[PDB]
Amino acid sequence: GMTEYKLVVVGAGGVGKSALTIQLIQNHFVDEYDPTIEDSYRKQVVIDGETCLLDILDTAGQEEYSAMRDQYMRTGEGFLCVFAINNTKSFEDIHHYREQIKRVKDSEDVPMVLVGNKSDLPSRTVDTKQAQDLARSYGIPFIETSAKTRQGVDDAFYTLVREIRKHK
Ligand SMILES: C[C@H]1CNCCCN1c1nccc(-c2noc([C@@]3(C)CCCc4sc(N)c(C#N)c43)n2)n1
Ligand SMILES: Nc1nc2c(ncn2[C@@H]2O[C@H](COP(=O)(O)OP(=O)(O)O)[C@@H](O)[C@H]2O)c(=O)[nH]1
Ligand SMILES: [Mg+2]
Numbered sequence: 001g002m003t004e005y006k007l008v009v010v011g012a013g014g015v016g017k018s019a020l021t022i023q024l025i026q027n028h029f030v031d032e033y034d035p036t037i038e039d040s041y042r043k044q045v046v047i048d049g050e051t052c053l054l055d056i057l058d059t060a061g062q063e064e065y066s067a068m069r070d071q072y073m074r075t076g077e078g079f080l081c082v083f084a085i086n087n088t089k090s091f092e093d094i095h096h097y098r099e100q101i102k103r104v105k106d107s108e109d110v111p112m113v114l115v116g117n118k119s120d121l122p123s124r125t126v127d128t129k130q131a132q133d134l135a136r137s138y139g140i141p142f143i144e145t146s147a148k149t150r151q152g153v154d155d156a157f158y159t160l161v162r163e164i165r166k167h168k
Helices: 017-026 067-074 088-092 094-105 128-138 153-167
Strands: 004-010 039-047 050-058 078-084 112-117 142-144
Touching: 004 017, 004 153, 017 039, 017 050, 017 078, 017 112, 017 153, 039 153, 050 153, 067 094, 078 088, 078 094, 078 153, 088 094, 088 128, 094 112, 112 128, 112 153, 128 142, 142 153
Parallel strands: 004 050, 004 078, 078 112, 112 142
Antiparallel strands: 039 050
């Protein structure tokens, strides 16, 4: 049977969660996607020669710590924690996203990748060393991406699948 991997993309509003998801789905950069739309999208891909089905939840909206939202997020098998390299606040939020993921999964071992998006921009405020060091602190991979140019997009999603495979 073809394995399906449920991946959830999280991070502050405006970091490029939708742009990254749509680059994976459409193979096209979408600079404008209603920031309120939270939805899921599937794609069949080959990852290391194995054809699998990805189901990508692109999160959006206000925080809500409720039984129903926790249940929806608990469906995720792996998470991309996305910040933008020109937005320090988005980077400072990362620990909170990781903490909430571990809380809903009730696990100290949740497949996760740190993603530094907007790598095409010159306006960097978060050094690559700081981001690599954050991923090292938490023992997770770090991928530099640009939804604009497609830099890192497969690397981010496919690495997360590799992390789910290691966990399962
Ligand atoms: C960084 C904080 C600090 N608070 C002030 C506003 C900014 N923040 C903020 N904003 C918007 C969203 C989130 C946020 N934090 O986790 C999450 C996710 C989706 C991640 C996956 C696991 C769970 S489980 C659950 N119920 C969630 C929810 N809602 C989440 N989303 N956090
Ligand atoms: N230059 C650049 N802009 C990006 C990139 N990804 C997203 N954007 C822009 O960042 C803003 C937020 O993107 P969006 O995908 O809506 O973020 P979301 O709120 O996390 O879903 C929009 O103005 C996008 O055009 C990227 O990699 N590079
Ligand atoms: Mg969005």
